[PDB]
Amino acid sequence: ATGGTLAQQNLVGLREHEDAAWRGLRQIPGNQTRYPLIDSFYQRSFGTGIRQRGGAVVLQIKASGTYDIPTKWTNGGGFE
Amino acid sequence: ATGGTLAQQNLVGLREHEDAAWRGLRQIPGNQTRYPLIDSFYQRSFGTGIRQRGGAVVLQIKASGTYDIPTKWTNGGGFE
Amino acid sequence: NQGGYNTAGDIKYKTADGVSYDSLWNLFSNVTDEWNKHKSKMVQLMTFPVTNQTEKVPRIGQFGFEKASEFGVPESKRTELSFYQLAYDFEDYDLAFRYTWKFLRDAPSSQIKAYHNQALQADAKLIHRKVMEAIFDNREREADIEGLPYKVYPLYNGDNMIPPEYNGTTFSTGHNHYLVSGGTKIDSADVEMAADHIREHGYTEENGTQLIAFAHKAEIQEVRRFRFGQTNNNSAVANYDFVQSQGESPLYLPNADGLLGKQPQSMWKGLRVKGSYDDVLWIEEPTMPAGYVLFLATGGTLAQQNLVGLREHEDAAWRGLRQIPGNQTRYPLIDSFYQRSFGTGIRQRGGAVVLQIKASGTYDIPTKWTNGGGFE
């Protein structure tokens, strides 16, 4: 669904940290520093849930039986 | 014993370090930093001895046998 | 009581000797009542208006250093917090004044004003009873506040609260402040036991408190006979002696070895003091039932706040005694209501002790202050 009186906001909510110091994609300076090894880190922290549980429908095209979670979108099955 | 000619200074000497940069309670910056782990240290250095070896007496009230050091003030263990 | 509609036929005009009843009712229309002033003063000194706080937050753990090294690093240190709260009861009470159109035409205005003055005195009796049964009824009460259940408390009553440790003395579950004397007449061991049951929780004279005992004449007349090293009731021997207040009837000092106690001043908190035994002040309290003594801590560090919390409604439009206009009006029948709502609970569960003088068995709640019993 989209627009009109119900769908003034979309299906999935994105949650981010309460503090502006912890929102966004951030660089952390690493902990081996100069010689012989160097590192640095990127971090992002966020999460997801659905508000409008009736505002969208997933249809699977198969002949019979139970619904399958797509392996590429199983939670914990991978990242990026 | 206190005051008078012979006990004009207190019983126990506190030896702090020769350099002011090493006297007093100090904070050391630690060696885990930012991520994932953080630490810091507090450091104090001193020691103790007696000059006036006759300026005090310790009496223990017990029925027989040798003197016992109090457990709370035995040098071999504990720091409080 | 007497009740129902006021009617023509209840109106008296003159006595057989010709005195008007309007003049008789005009004695009662505006006078304050000395007994209900006393009951109001007992509420004033025994209660506080409820405000919201934690109980005393338990102290954190303490650290210790480690002997250093030139290669290693030291071990890490940590602590944690905790806190809790207590709650207070609440209830609604109301009276009615129903009349007929003939009664309001014919009755003297002094009778209506007397009925209003009596409603204000019915309120004083209600608040006093409800404060005193908060102390003397040794049972825990449930309350619902904003739809959630809560427990509201008497003094320590043999329940599963453990009093906090004081100066290295640790209490068990089953701690109690509703004590039975184990004898038909009070003795100095009962008085010393009861005052020490308070003073083990703090509340001591070194912390700047005063203890007060409120008692009936039948027990004060025993206590004022305690003299140092002499036998009392039940074969107890007194460890102090009773010292009269400076305002009492004169007394000869018994010995060159003078009385073991300081002389009390005439009054405490505007109440007259009989004297002191141990360091507690004894007050002849006319409201007190016969077989009972209330010991109470006051002042110092720990008892700046009175024993019983009064909770009134959260909105100012519902606080105080109120008149509600009523729903029979003008003719033929007239009705009007008084309403008050409040409740009570104890925060300082160790700040007082109730001692009952009986030979054996468990504590009995005084009938006049059993929680379900009435409204006076």
XYZ file of C-alpha atoms in Angstrom:
536
model
C 0.000 0.000 0.000
C 0.973 3.717 -0.465
C -0.436 7.261 0.122
C -4.055 8.083 1.105
C -5.194 8.188 4.771
C -3.537 4.946 6.098
C -0.160 4.788 4.257
C 1.125 8.295 5.208
C 4.235 6.350 6.370
C 5.786 3.193 4.873
C 5.759 -0.497 5.956
C 9.085 -0.894 7.876
C 10.397 1.302 10.711
C 14.163 1.958 10.974
C 15.356 2.508 14.589
C 18.632 4.305 15.422
C 20.344 5.264 18.725
C 18.920 8.041 20.965
C 22.275 9.933 20.954
C 23.561 11.823 17.879
C 27.099 10.648 18.835
C 25.999 7.026 18.044
C 23.776 7.514 14.937
C 25.077 7.174 11.347
C 27.999 5.223 9.852
C 30.997 6.003 12.126
C 34.775 5.460 12.028
C 36.545 4.182 15.186
C 40.400 4.712 15.230
C 41.536 1.023 15.559
C 43.769 -0.538 18.248
C 46.988 -1.496 16.450
C 48.242 1.916 15.439
C 51.414 2.556 13.367
C 54.045 -0.197 13.088
C 54.248 -2.991 12.043
C 50.408 -3.291 11.792
C 47.597 -0.745 11.398
C 43.819 -1.147 11.703
C 40.634 0.963 11.814
C 36.911 0.196 12.185
C 33.611 1.247 10.665
C 30.444 0.786 12.720
C 26.720 1.247 12.161
C 24.009 0.324 14.678
C 20.286 0.234 13.781
C 17.300 -2.160 13.587
C 13.942 -2.946 11.973
C 10.294 -3.878 12.677
C 6.919 -3.544 10.834
C 4.182 -1.185 12.139
C 1.484 -1.671 9.465
C 1.227 -5.527 9.668
C -1.735 -5.448 7.201
C -0.299 -2.809 4.760
C 1.624 -5.308 2.572
C 1.328 -8.963 1.410
C 4.072 -11.414 0.389
C 3.030 -13.936 -2.267
C 5.117 -17.048 -2.988
C 4.574 -18.805 -6.363
C 4.701 -22.578 -5.606
C 2.346 -25.531 -6.207
C 1.463 -26.509 -2.563
C 2.450 -26.469 1.137
C 4.278 -24.254 3.685
C 5.793 -20.792 2.984
C 9.617 -20.690 2.558
C 11.880 -17.905 3.900
C 14.272 -16.897 1.033
C 17.805 -18.080 2.045
C 19.262 -14.687 0.939
C 16.962 -12.960 3.515
C 17.006 -15.440 6.450
C 17.861 -13.491 9.634
C 21.377 -14.510 10.854
C 22.087 -16.420 7.569
C 24.495 -13.632 6.440
C 25.048 -9.851 6.165
C 25.243 -7.258 3.330
C 55.216 8.422 73.961
C 54.487 11.932 72.549
C 55.914 15.487 72.895
C 58.798 16.554 75.189
C 62.502 16.442 74.219
C 62.779 12.895 72.843
C 59.361 12.222 71.129
C 59.020 15.622 69.373
C 58.258 13.809 66.029
C 55.711 11.003 65.439
C 56.540 7.270 65.484
C 56.312 6.147 61.797
C 58.094 7.688 58.798
C 56.224 7.850 55.458
C 58.759 7.612 52.589
C 57.174 9.022 49.419
C 59.258 9.171 46.178
C 62.067 11.730 45.584
C 60.382 13.233 42.441
C 57.121 15.260 42.621
C 55.966 13.615 39.337
C 55.811 10.276 41.282
C 54.427 11.563 44.649
C 50.717 11.406 45.554
C 47.920 9.248 44.093
C 48.168 9.294 40.256
C 46.024 8.240 37.288
C 47.741 6.355 34.441
C 45.947 6.446 31.004
C 45.692 2.603 30.611
C 46.473 0.546 27.472
C 43.104 -0.682 26.168
C 41.380 2.303 24.458
C 38.107 3.307 22.629
C 37.017 -0.082 21.223
C 36.126 -2.823 22.048
C 37.696 -2.559 25.560
C 38.806 0.396 27.715
C 40.938 0.606 30.885
C 42.688 3.043 33.263
C 44.873 2.720 36.392
C 45.360 4.366 39.785
C 48.893 4.181 41.198
C 50.235 5.071 44.692
C 53.790 4.509 46.004
C 55.209 4.889 49.536
C 56.615 2.898 52.466
C 57.029 2.876 56.238
C 59.641 2.401 59.004
C 60.301 3.349 62.673
C 63.272 5.399 64.012
C 62.305 5.643 67.730
C 62.284 1.823 68.383
C 61.664 2.440 72.136
C 58.978 5.175 71.720
C 56.058 2.706 71.923
C 55.046 -0.709 73.352
C 52.433 -3.184 72.098
C 50.770 -5.282 74.820
C 48.671 -8.352 73.939
C 46.177 -9.707 76.506
C 46.494 -13.518 76.291
C 47.086 -16.244 78.885
C 50.462 -17.665 77.650
C 52.865 -18.023 74.666
C 54.501 -15.600 72.179
C 53.062 -12.385 70.689
C 50.634 -12.732 67.728
C 50.466 -10.093 64.969
C 46.812 -8.907 64.480
C 45.351 -10.518 61.309
C 44.054 -7.121 60.028
C 47.643 -5.710 60.255
C 49.735 -8.728 59.169
C 52.057 -7.512 56.350
C 51.879 -10.833 54.399
C 48.382 -10.252 52.879
C 45.507 -7.789 52.328
C 45.560 -4.072 51.372
C 42.678 -2.720 53.543
C -26.962 7.651 66.588
C -30.317 9.217 65.587
C -31.305 9.494 61.903
C -33.778 9.994 59.058
C -35.593 13.108 57.811
C -36.070 16.057 60.151
C -39.857 16.653 60.311
C -42.335 19.062 61.822
C -42.966 17.201 65.102
C -39.191 17.241 65.794
C -39.449 21.021 66.342
C -39.770 22.170 69.974
C -40.700 25.870 70.373
C -40.475 26.549 74.149
C -39.818 24.570 77.351
C -42.587 24.078 79.980
C -41.120 27.126 81.865
C -41.124 29.250 78.636
C -37.412 29.253 77.511
C -37.111 29.230 73.672
C -35.314 26.247 72.095
C -33.742 28.705 69.613
C -31.756 30.124 72.576
C -30.709 26.575 73.648
C -29.545 25.559 70.130
C -27.650 28.882 69.936
C -25.267 27.518 72.632
C -24.191 24.694 70.242
C -24.261 26.570 66.889
C -20.722 28.090 67.032
C -18.702 26.595 69.957
C -15.547 24.576 69.379
C -15.403 21.336 71.435
C -12.406 20.924 73.798
C -12.342 17.128 73.396
C -12.304 17.326 69.589
C -9.563 20.001 69.808
C -7.520 17.443 71.824
C -8.206 14.694 69.217
C -7.225 17.170 66.450
C -3.932 17.936 68.283
C -3.162 14.194 68.578
C -3.588 13.941 64.770
C -1.438 17.063 64.208
C 1.553 15.736 66.228
C 1.196 12.060 65.137
C 0.896 12.563 61.316
C 2.703 13.999 58.268
C 1.239 14.952 54.835
C 2.487 12.214 52.449
C 5.290 13.030 49.976
C 7.038 10.587 47.647
C 10.538 9.256 48.465
C 12.671 6.147 48.261
C 13.608 4.457 51.494
C 17.288 4.885 52.526
C 19.481 3.722 49.600
C 21.896 0.916 50.740
C 25.599 1.955 50.523
C 27.941 0.730 47.707
C 30.921 -1.630 48.172
C 34.427 -0.235 48.803
C 37.691 -0.801 46.870
C 41.282 -1.920 47.703
C 44.665 -1.534 45.945
C 46.949 -4.355 44.729
C 50.779 -4.561 45.021
C 52.214 -3.345 41.687
C 54.571 -4.995 39.189
C 56.982 -3.834 36.447
C 55.589 -6.256 33.784
C 51.924 -7.006 34.746
C 48.664 -4.984 35.029
C 46.214 -4.864 38.009
C 42.793 -6.541 38.457
C 39.551 -4.597 37.762
C 36.974 -3.271 40.329
C 33.109 -2.839 40.363
C 29.877 -2.062 42.369
C 26.049 -1.934 41.997
C 22.993 -0.084 43.463
C 19.475 -0.939 44.718
C 16.472 0.993 46.201
C 12.812 0.560 47.298
C 9.582 2.459 48.167
C 6.475 2.171 50.426
C 2.777 3.108 49.810
C -0.300 4.551 51.669
C -4.028 3.632 51.815
C -7.012 5.777 50.621
C -10.810 5.677 51.235
C -14.034 7.744 50.879
C -16.520 8.600 53.646
C -19.831 10.627 53.586
C -22.763 11.711 55.881
C -26.306 13.002 54.899
C -28.698 15.763 56.239
C -32.299 15.097 54.974
C -35.212 17.518 55.944
C -38.934 18.103 54.983
C -40.176 21.506 53.585
C -42.151 22.044 56.874
C -39.042 21.520 58.999
C -37.022 24.185 57.093
C -39.988 26.626 57.304
C -40.568 26.196 61.041
C -37.232 25.102 62.700
C -34.855 27.684 64.326
C -31.743 28.624 62.271
C -29.621 27.793 65.359
C -30.523 24.081 64.908
C -29.254 24.037 61.288
C -26.017 25.784 62.384
C -25.649 23.291 65.266
C -25.992 20.361 62.744
C -23.211 21.959 60.587
C -20.931 22.428 63.640
C -21.565 18.746 64.537
C -20.525 17.605 61.000
C -17.119 19.330 61.462
C -16.773 17.436 64.780
C -17.785 14.131 63.081
C -14.838 14.721 60.703
C -12.372 15.257 63.598
C -13.508 11.939 65.204
C -13.111 10.057 61.877
C -9.572 11.315 61.112
C -8.444 10.620 64.702
C -9.803 7.021 64.642
C -8.184 6.291 61.257
C -4.764 7.588 62.402
C -4.885 5.594 65.661
C -5.919 2.305 64.002
C -3.012 2.764 61.540
C -0.761 2.384 64.649
C -2.753 -0.015 66.855
C -4.101 -2.482 64.241
C -1.123 -4.849 63.763
C -2.354 -6.213 60.361
C -0.941 -5.522 56.901
C -3.449 -3.948 54.436
C -3.748 -4.287 50.682
C -4.458 -1.107 48.690
C -5.117 -0.539 44.961
C -3.470 2.592 43.507
C -4.028 3.401 39.795
C -5.339 -0.195 39.402
C -2.134 -1.895 40.739
C -2.026 -3.715 44.134
C 0.252 -2.484 46.968
C 0.929 -3.547 50.604
C 0.707 -0.897 53.371
C 2.111 -1.532 56.786
C 1.723 -1.299 60.578
C 4.810 -1.254 62.858
C 7.033 -4.404 62.585
C 4.493 -7.222 63.204
C 6.307 -10.603 63.014
C 6.312 -10.435 59.182
C 9.056 -11.165 56.609
C 10.533 -7.621 56.434
C 14.001 -7.606 58.034
C 14.884 -4.281 59.741
C 18.147 -2.738 58.380
C 21.365 -3.386 60.358
C 22.424 -0.640 62.805
C 25.915 -0.363 64.448
C 26.658 -4.026 63.532
C 23.461 -5.528 65.087
C 21.552 -7.540 62.440
C 17.854 -8.398 62.826
C 15.962 -11.532 61.623
C 12.610 -12.008 59.905
C 9.805 -12.095 62.514
C 10.797 -8.768 64.157
C 7.866 -7.355 66.184
C 6.708 -4.129 67.948
C 3.314 -5.382 69.245
C 4.541 -6.644 72.627
C 2.732 -8.496 75.473
C 3.969 -7.701 79.004
C 3.518 -11.240 80.434
C 1.999 -9.850 83.682
C -1.265 -8.292 84.971
C 0.419 -4.928 85.866
C 3.251 -3.025 84.101
C 6.820 -3.238 85.493
C 10.176 -1.549 84.802
C 11.468 -4.529 82.777
C 8.502 -4.070 80.392
C 9.281 -0.337 80.059
C 13.032 -0.916 79.575
C 12.389 -3.769 77.070
C 9.967 -1.637 75.035
C 12.222 1.458 74.945
C 15.209 -0.734 73.924
C 13.120 -2.328 71.120
C 12.914 1.208 69.651
C 16.525 2.212 70.438
C 18.066 -0.877 68.780
C 16.976 0.604 65.359
C 18.765 3.931 65.960
C 16.383 6.506 67.530
C 18.683 6.929 70.589
C 19.201 9.935 72.860
C 22.775 10.299 71.439
C 21.191 10.683 67.963
C 19.206 13.592 69.551
C 15.772 11.891 69.847
C 13.249 12.101 72.631
C 11.150 9.000 73.384
C 7.563 9.653 74.580
C 5.203 7.148 76.233
C 1.440 7.802 76.044
C -0.426 5.813 78.702
C -3.676 5.501 80.668
C -3.849 6.525 84.394
C -3.976 2.875 85.533
C -0.452 2.255 84.107
C 1.052 5.688 84.933
C 0.164 5.135 88.620
C 2.375 1.994 88.511
C 5.256 3.608 86.584
C 5.542 6.639 88.917
C 6.287 4.195 91.807
C 9.492 2.836 90.163
C 12.562 3.564 92.385
C 16.146 2.446 91.772
C 16.994 -1.047 93.100
C 13.444 -1.558 94.536
C 11.075 -4.389 93.505
C 8.003 -3.503 91.336
C 5.144 -5.667 90.020
C 5.975 -9.203 88.732
C 9.248 -9.226 90.825
C 11.060 -6.837 88.412
C 13.739 -4.501 89.933
C 14.000 -0.924 88.600
C 17.310 0.174 87.003
C 16.339 3.896 87.160
C 13.802 5.967 89.116
C 10.749 7.964 88.053
C 11.390 11.736 88.170
C 8.296 13.968 88.367
C 7.914 16.877 85.945
C 8.577 20.314 87.535
C 4.777 21.074 87.525
C 3.586 18.018 89.575
C 2.446 17.855 93.246
C 5.407 18.223 95.692
C 7.396 15.123 96.765
C 10.163 14.499 99.357
C 13.448 13.223 97.864
C 13.883 9.774 99.505
C 17.655 9.712 100.144
C 20.825 11.887 100.192
C 21.722 9.626 97.218
C 19.454 11.694 94.878
C 17.168 10.499 92.004
C 18.801 8.763 88.980
C 17.249 10.875 86.197
C 16.972 14.495 84.986
C 13.778 16.412 85.902
C 11.455 16.879 82.854
C 10.054 20.271 81.891
C 6.290 20.931 82.410
C 5.129 20.280 78.801
C 6.152 18.489 75.595
C 4.547 19.674 72.301
C 1.840 21.527 74.321
C 0.877 18.324 76.268
C 1.540 18.111 80.062
C 4.249 15.592 81.120
C 3.880 13.429 84.282
C 7.597 12.626 84.578
C 10.361 10.424 83.167
C 11.664 6.880 83.739
C 14.783 5.790 81.851
C 15.031 8.845 79.468
C 11.431 8.455 78.086
C 8.806 11.120 78.989
C 5.437 9.833 80.263
C 2.213 11.577 79.212
C -1.222 10.932 80.727
C -3.227 10.403 77.537
C -7.048 10.398 77.971
C -7.644 8.846 74.490
C -5.524 5.752 75.366
C -7.313 2.392 76.115
C -6.674 0.914 79.569
C -4.268 -2.037 79.035
C -1.959 -0.313 76.473
C 1.091 1.968 76.152
C 2.363 3.627 72.972
C 6.105 4.337 72.968
C 7.134 6.802 70.218
C 10.467 8.253 69.000
C 10.696 11.978 68.052
C 13.278 14.496 66.756
C 17.040 13.937 66.384
C 18.537 12.718 63.067
C 16.195 9.800 62.345
C 12.699 10.970 63.517
C 12.264 14.487 62.001
C 9.074 13.077 60.345
C 5.963 12.003 62.353
C 4.888 8.314 62.495
C 1.747 8.088 60.257
C 1.491 9.392 56.675
C -1.804 11.026 55.633
C -2.670 10.592 51.947
C -5.334 12.905 50.503
C -6.681 12.906 46.906
C -4.223 13.925 44.185
C -6.513 16.803 42.912
C -7.115 19.926 45.102
C -10.836 19.989 44.120
C -11.231 16.658 46.054
C -9.051 17.503 49.123
C -10.536 18.527 52.490
C -14.043 18.076 53.894
C -16.591 19.097 51.197
C -20.323 19.788 50.960
C -22.140 18.189 47.981
C -25.494 19.890 47.054
C -27.687 16.718 47.254
C -30.456 15.438 44.975
C -33.773 15.950 46.736
C -34.414 19.737 46.683
C -36.796 22.579 47.745
C -40.124 20.664 48.066
C -41.341 18.334 49.553
C -37.926 16.943 50.649
C -34.426 18.445 50.929
C -31.102 16.547 51.079
C -27.403 17.521 51.423
C -24.106 15.623 51.822
C -20.718 15.962 53.499
C -17.862 13.972 51.924
C -14.216 13.425 52.909
C -11.605 11.048 51.538
C -8.104 10.205 52.760
C -6.025 7.256 54.002
C -2.993 6.244 56.042
C 0.188 4.125 56.303
C 3.436 3.887 58.354
C 6.844 4.504 56.721
C 9.093 4.241 59.828
C 8.004 0.691 60.902
C 10.438 0.771 63.910
C 9.764 4.366 65.157
C 7.235 3.288 67.851
C 6.227 0.261 70.021
C 2.803 -0.807 71.310
C 2.910 -2.641 74.658
C -0.140 -4.525 75.990
C -0.448 -5.326 79.717
C -1.885 -8.882 79.917
C -0.728 -12.056 81.683
C -0.211 -14.412 78.664
C -0.988 -15.062 74.950
C -0.824 -12.925 71.750
C -1.490 -9.185 71.249
C -5.131 -7.963 71.004
C -6.030 -4.907 68.876
C -7.982 -2.329 71.012
C -11.690 -2.729 70.053
C -12.139 1.063 69.514
C -9.313 0.920 66.883
C -9.984 -2.390 65.052
C -9.785 -1.409 61.335
C -13.271 -2.707 60.299
C -15.051 -1.638 63.506
C -16.626 1.814 62.808
C -16.140 5.566 62.190
C -16.912 7.219 65.607
